[PDB]
Amino acid sequence: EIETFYKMLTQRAEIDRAFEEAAGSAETLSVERLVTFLQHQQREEEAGPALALSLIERYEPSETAKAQRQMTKDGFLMYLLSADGNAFSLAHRRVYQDMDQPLSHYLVSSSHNTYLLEDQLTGPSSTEAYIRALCKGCRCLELDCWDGPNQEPIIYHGYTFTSKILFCDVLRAIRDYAFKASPYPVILSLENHCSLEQQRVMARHLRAILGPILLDQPLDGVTTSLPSPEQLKGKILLKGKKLKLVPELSDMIIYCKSVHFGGFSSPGTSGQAFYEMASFSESRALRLLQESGNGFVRHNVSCLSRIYPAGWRTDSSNYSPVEMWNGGCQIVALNFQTPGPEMDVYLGCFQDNGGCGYVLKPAFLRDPNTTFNSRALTQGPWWRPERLRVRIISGQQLPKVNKNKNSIVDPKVIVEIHGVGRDTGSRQTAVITNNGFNPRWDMEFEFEVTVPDLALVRFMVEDYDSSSKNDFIGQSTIPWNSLKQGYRHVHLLSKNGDQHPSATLFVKISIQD
Ligand SMILES: [La+3]
Ligand SMILES: [La+3]
Ligand SMILES: [La+3]
Ligand SMILES: [La+3]
To answer: Which residues make up the binding site for Ca(2+) 3?
Structure first.
């Protein structure tokens, strides 16, 4: 009974089944059989003895089997629960993209009113807020500078009751964390409401504190286009108004001069210079995407655009970034302090490319002559329909969330597709009652995705409640091109983006054209 219980609790038929198929009669997976699995099931492109062997050396617990080059059911499971078995491509969890194109070519991880920890009206501000964002890979930060006592500028939310902090204090924190998560450039958006004098103080602090990290001169030969993340590695650059404004500050604005949206027209006139950056509220952005779409896109190829949350979002709620990315908008600022599907999707996007904060835009969005408009889909390279089938098999050790000890989760799983409007979809599994340890769904969904290069697949697990709103249990959002095939485990994250060490979903993914 003990082994029974101990082992039965521990038992996963789906795994058993999976191994069996792979291994057939044998109680072991030979290299060849493993290689076959890797290819047929896991659809690995580098599938071959070499991979198989590394998987064995890496994950096989049995010394006999390891040495003898074979994989036991145990090693199978371990591989499946490891970074290699993760539905989120391990290969993409390291900088692997081309980091040599103009900044305008990458989506950049950006935060809105970074200094804030809660609401926009009366919640607190803190350097901690900048540290958190930076530690989550945020590249573009916001500083709302106002005159403070003792000729020391402060940062807070202009015209509200949000607590205040010191501009200098903010700079040190940025200085200390700017590159903890990535080596690529950090952009500081200065919304300067300070007096001339205090503006000078700002400049002094900038130079004194940031020192050599601060970019205060154009790079050599950085003429027709924006420098690349590579060219700006290890640097912090300022975005703000460039000559009310003291020269000390205005002179530090090199590649990001705040500008009012003129309109889009590129033959050298109208559509701003590569070193000019416009901002658009969520509303105006949608409208321009509604009406212009392709203009914006084309605009965004050589130009950085910044989008920020609608003013009514005083609760610091966030909008969907995806809609902005579909127009090539790169600096899509969100309230990083706020848990929700939006940051889930955001951080899922940026978990790609090594989490360095710059993710290369799809080629059609880097083509100045594109006729793409996610909203009016016509044929073109972006059109490449795929058939995704996702099987939600079972869940393991779902984080018991709210109640301290009184009930068991009644989990269900929602799988959503995020991307161009026609691709967006959502489906959900049934609810398993009182089981978070090993709920088993064995449900399969199928989606047709026409513009995968802009899609993300999200897995959300909820605790069903008949009486109330279902509690969020965990989630995971995987960019389409990082979605691995075959049997994989989805590693669930908390509301706050934290890793749940033992919480997973076991799935089987398949993508066919
Ligand atoms: La602001
Ligand atoms: La229950
Ligand atoms: La419940
Ligand atoms: La509940």
So the answer is: 113, 142, 144, 191
Looking at all shown ligands, the one closest to residue 471's CA atom is: 4
Which tokens hold the place of 288? Answer: 């321009």
Residues contacting 201, CB < 8 A, separation 6+: 151, 152, 153, 167, 194
Catalytic residue flag (residue 157): yes
Query: What would the two tokens of residue 484 be?
Result: 């691995």
Residue 312 CB-density burial (10 A; 0-12 exposed, 13-18 middle, 19+ buried): exposed
Q: Is 418 tagged catalytic?
A: no
252 alpha carbon to ligand 1 midpoint, in Å? 19
The reply to whether 351 falls in a domain is yes
Ion ligand 3 residues within 5 Å by Cβ: 410, 463, 465
Number of helices (H), then strands (E), belonging to the chain: the values are 14, 22
What's the rounded Cα separation, in Å, for the pair 412 and 441?
A: 8
Strand partners, 258: 277
* Rounded distance between C-alpha atoms, residue 487 and residue 73, angstroms: 14
Asked if residue 464 belongs to a known ligand binding site, the reply is yes
Experimental method: X-ray
* Marked catalytic residue, from 112, 205, 299, 489: 112
Cα(240)–Cα(145) distance, integer angstroms: 11
Structurally, the chain folds into a number of domains equal to: 3
Residue of 157, 418, 489, 491 marked active site: 157
Residue 449 belongs to some domain of the structure: yes
Give a yes or no: residue 2 inside a domain: no
Q: Which residues contact 111 (CB under 8 A, 6 or more apart)?
A: 133, 138, 140, 141, 142, 333, 334, 335, 336
Q: Under DSSP, is residue 297 helix (H, G, I), strand (E, B) or coil?
A: helix
Query: Domain range spanning residue 63?
Result: 11-93
> Which residues make beta-bridge pairs with 308?
281
Residue 4 lies in a domain: no
- Residue at which a domain ends, from 363, 382, 401: 382
Return the ligand number nearest the Cα of 464: 3
At which of 93, 122, 141 does a domain end?
93
Distance 81 CA to ligand 3 centre (A): 27
User: Is 311 found in the same domain as 201?
Assistant: yes
Q: Which helix (H) or strand (E) holds 236?
A: strand 236-240
How far, in Å, is the centroid of ligand 4 from the Cα of 402?
A: 7
Other CB atoms within 10 A of residue 140 CB: 26
404 alpha carbon – ligand 4 mean position (Å): 11
Among all ligands shown, which has an atom nearest to the Cα of 408? 2
